[PDB]
Amino acid sequence: TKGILGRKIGMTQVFGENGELIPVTVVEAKENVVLQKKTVEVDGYNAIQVGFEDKKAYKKDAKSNKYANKPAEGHAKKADAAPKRFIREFRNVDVDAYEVGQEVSVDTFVAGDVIDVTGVSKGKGFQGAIKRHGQSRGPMSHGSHFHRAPGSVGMASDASRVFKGQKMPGRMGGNTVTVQNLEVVQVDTENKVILVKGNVPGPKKGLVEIRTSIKKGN
Amino acid sequence: MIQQETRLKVADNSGAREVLTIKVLGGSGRKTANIGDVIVCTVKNATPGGVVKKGDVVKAVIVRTKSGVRRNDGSYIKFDENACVIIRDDKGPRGTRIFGPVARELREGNFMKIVSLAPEVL
Amino acid sequence: IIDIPSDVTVTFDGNHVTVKGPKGELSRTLNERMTFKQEENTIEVVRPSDSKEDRTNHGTTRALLNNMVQGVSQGYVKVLELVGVGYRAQMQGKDLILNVGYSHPVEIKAEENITFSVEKNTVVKVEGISKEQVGALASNIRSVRPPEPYKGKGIRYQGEYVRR
Amino acid sequence: MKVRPSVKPICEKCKVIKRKGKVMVICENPKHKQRQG
RNA sequence: AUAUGUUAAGUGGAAAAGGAUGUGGCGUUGCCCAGACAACUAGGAUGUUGGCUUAGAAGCAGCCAUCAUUUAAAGAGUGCG
RNA sequence: GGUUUGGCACCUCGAUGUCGGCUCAUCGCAUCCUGGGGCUGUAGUCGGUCCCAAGGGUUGGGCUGUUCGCCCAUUAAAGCG
RNA sequence: GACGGGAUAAGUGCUGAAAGCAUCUAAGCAUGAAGCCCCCCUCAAGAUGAGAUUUCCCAACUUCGGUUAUAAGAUCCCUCA
Ligand SMILES: [Mg+2]
Ligand SMILES: [Zn+2]
């Protein structure tokens, strides 16, 4: 059991040894570090607190997240670590391992292993019904005027209210996502790069998050 | 992709030249088809002679599709036309010849009598 | 009343009771509304009234003290024969194996004071102290292939017969 | 089983009992298995 | 709250023909220690399907002629087929 | 039961717009398929009937304005409201 | 889409009386469906019961209560996805 962070950078091609073309995701686990170790003794759950991008030291008169407010620095000086931009946890891990304040290098992973992922989805604005939900559009000609709009909401003069679960134009994008049952292809420790079969919810340079699958079959 | 009310050529010794795709056997209301997918067709014209006639209705097995198939090696293929072949659930044809070359992925479906005849398995 | 034969000790504590014997020992509980004595080598049932329910608990509890007291000295047994072709059965390990034309064999595990006894490949028996346990287990076997109706190919108690 | 709101012993051996408030019968002949409700 | 019973169903806090070993009440009355009911073991008819029979059917196709005594005791069969 | 054809004339005449189809669905269960079961005049595969169960699914076309309906070809099933 | 487990309806039982027998049930014990729940994905402390953890800032004015411009921090402003 294990899990790391990373960054979607791009997708490519890569071949199996039977000649089967195999698509692939690229991800970068650069500068992963463990920061804090949240026991069940105090909090009520056993987990691992983590950090990914090196950022810089304390402000002087300074400004946004490129640099670091003191409390972050007060958290990263703690375990002999440089301050980090993205912090995330990982429950369901062998907390007996992972001393506070080390690295979670890609070598924990291995070719052939199965995984899930997590990440934000993509930017998408006020999208209509049929693009948000996939409803079916209406007729063009034969004189109509109902091309794309969401249809008749509800029932009648009775059942006056409109039920909550309906389907309407709102934003389509920002959502936590998970994609069970992907596989790993390769682990290049040189560039500290990993490769994941299939494709992941992310934009370029976005956040991506990984862990060992749960539905192995058990 | 091949679907309902789609007209095709043919390949065999039938006495027939083109057909119509009524239904595209599979599942619970498939719309589509590709190489390998058996279908239920009929006949909209005929050359003279031959066993089959106008107004008839029989099955067929698709081959020579115009939006070809992706092989798992990452290679593709494309013909120009669409076509089919007549069949009787021996999975062996009525006909005696096959013009118009064949797509090989039929082999997974265990069709070999028409693959005996086709220039060429491709 | 109830007998207390040789080497069968009797110790009662209100609702719970413990009784002892050669083939083992039991510890059952009863309804506390009942009442009890122990005469020297014999037993004295009580009920508090002629109420409806109390009659039930009276005759019942006779039956249960009888069950313990007979089980500890004698213990009980059940005869679950197999009849058919390809039917085979054998205690192997602490557990039982079976082979009945299913694509897979079967496993069964015991309890304390249980003994999956066998005479040979196609007949078995369990012998124990609690009549309850041995029969419950017996149906957990017999439920796996009930007696089919035409030929009788299947697990069965012995006297159980055929019904097309 | 034969579920019928009318219940009456169809033959001599059919013996009547109440199981869970409901009524049933037994005969050792399955084709006489009746439940009331 | 008081005294007295009933209900075991959320009846109360919607519904009929009809069905039932649910319980309670008021009565009629049979069998019961010259040892009842009930189950277990103990026996089951002798000739004889006996007449007329019915595929053979020998408690039994059923139309019944359906007697006595081996006898605790049993019917030209209580009965299961 | 209150889905039909009806009876009634209680709201509505200083306006409650009706058939059918498109998009949207939502619900009940007296279940059309899957799941589990009992019985069988169930040898097996296929079945008939009854019970629990409403979690999900319940198709394309021809024909008419069409509910309905007939038909073609599919399908595990092509539900009643 | 799972696997898997917990409790379950229909049903099958075990022991067993009321009712010496038989009895799946009233005392007791088990068993059993895509259903219920738990697990799976997501949102979510305005859950006014407003949570918990780590870290950071830390004066002078005697109104005593209180006031202050500032601290950490965030913003106004600007370049841009
Ligand atoms: Mg036309
Ligand atoms: Zn009967």
Swiss-Prot record, chain A:
One of its GO terms (cellular component) is cytosolic large ribosomal subunit. InterPro entries: Ribosomal_uL3, Ribosomal_uL3_bac/org-type, Ribosomal_uL3_CS, Transl_B-barrel_sf. Gene3D superfamilies: 3.30.160.810, Translation factors (2.40.30.10). HAMAP family: Ribosomal_uL3_B (MF_01325_B). It comes from the Bacteria. It comes from Staphylococcus aureus (strain NCTC 8325 / PS 47). GO terms for molecular function: rRNA binding; structural constituent of ribosome. This is Large ribosomal subunit protein uL3.
Curated annotation (Swiss-Prot), chain B:
Gene3D superfamilies: Ribosomal protein L14 (2.40.150.20). One of its GO terms (cellular component) is cytosolic large ribosomal subunit. Keywords: Ribonucleoprotein, Ribosomal protein, RNA-binding, rRNA-binding. InterPro entries: Ribosomal_uL14, Ribosomal_uL14_bac-type, Ribosomal_uL14_CS, Ribosomal_uL14_sf. The keyword rRNA-binding applies. One of its GO terms (biological process) is translation. It holds the Pfam family Ribosomal_L14. One of its GO terms (molecular function) is large ribosomal subunit rRNA binding. SMART domains: Ribosomal_L14 (SM01374). The keyword Chloroplast does not apply. Belongs to the universal ribosomal protein uL14 family. HAMAP family: Ribosomal_uL14. PANTHER family: 50S/60S RIBOSOMAL PROTEIN L14/L23 (PTHR11761), LARGE RIBOSOMAL SUBUNIT PROTEIN UL14M (PTHR11761:SF3). Part of the 50S ribosomal subunit. Forms a cluster with proteins L3 and L19. In the 70S ribosome, L14 and L19 interact and together make contacts with the 16S rRNA in bridges B5 and B8. Binds to 23S rRNA. Forms part of two intersubunit bridges in the 70S ribosome. This is Large ribosomal subunit protein uL14. It comes from Staphylococcus aureus (strain NCTC 8325 / PS 47). The gene is rplN.
Curated annotation (Swiss-Prot), chain C:
PROSITE patterns: RIBOSOMAL_L6_1. GO terms for cellular component: cytosolic large ribosomal subunit. Pfam families: Ribosomal_L6. The gene is rplF. HAMAP family: Ribosomal_uL6_B. Transmembrane segments: none annotated. GO terms for molecular function: rRNA binding; structural constituent of ribosome. NCBIfam families: L6_bact. The keyword RNA-binding applies. Keywords: Ribonucleoprotein, Ribosomal protein, RNA-binding, rRNA-binding. Belongs to the universal ribosomal protein uL6 family. It comes from the Bacteria. Part of the 50S ribosomal subunit. This is Large ribosomal subunit protein uL6. This protein binds to the 23S rRNA, and is important in its secondary structure. It is located near the subunit interface in the base of the L7/L12 stalk, and near the tRNA binding site of the peptidyltransferase center. GO terms for biological process: cytoplasmic translation. InterPro entries: Ribosomal_uL6-like, Ribosomal_uL6-like_a/b-dom_sf, Ribosomal_uL6_a/b-dom, Ribosomal_uL6_bac-type, Ribosomal_uL6_CS.
UniProtKB/Swiss-Prot annotation, chain D:
InterPro entries: Ribosomal_bL36 (IPR000473), Ribosomal_bL36_sp (IPR035977). The lineage of its organism: Bacteria, Bacillati, Bacillota, Bacilli, Bacillales. It holds the Pfam family Ribosomal_L36. SUPFAM superfamilies: Ribosomal protein L36 (SSF57840). One of its GO terms (biological process) is translation. This is Large ribosomal subunit protein bL36. It comes from Staphylococcus aureus (strain NCTC 8325 / PS 47). The keyword Ribonucleoprotein applies. One of its GO terms (cellular component) is ribonucleoprotein complex. Keywords: Ribonucleoprotein, Ribosomal protein.
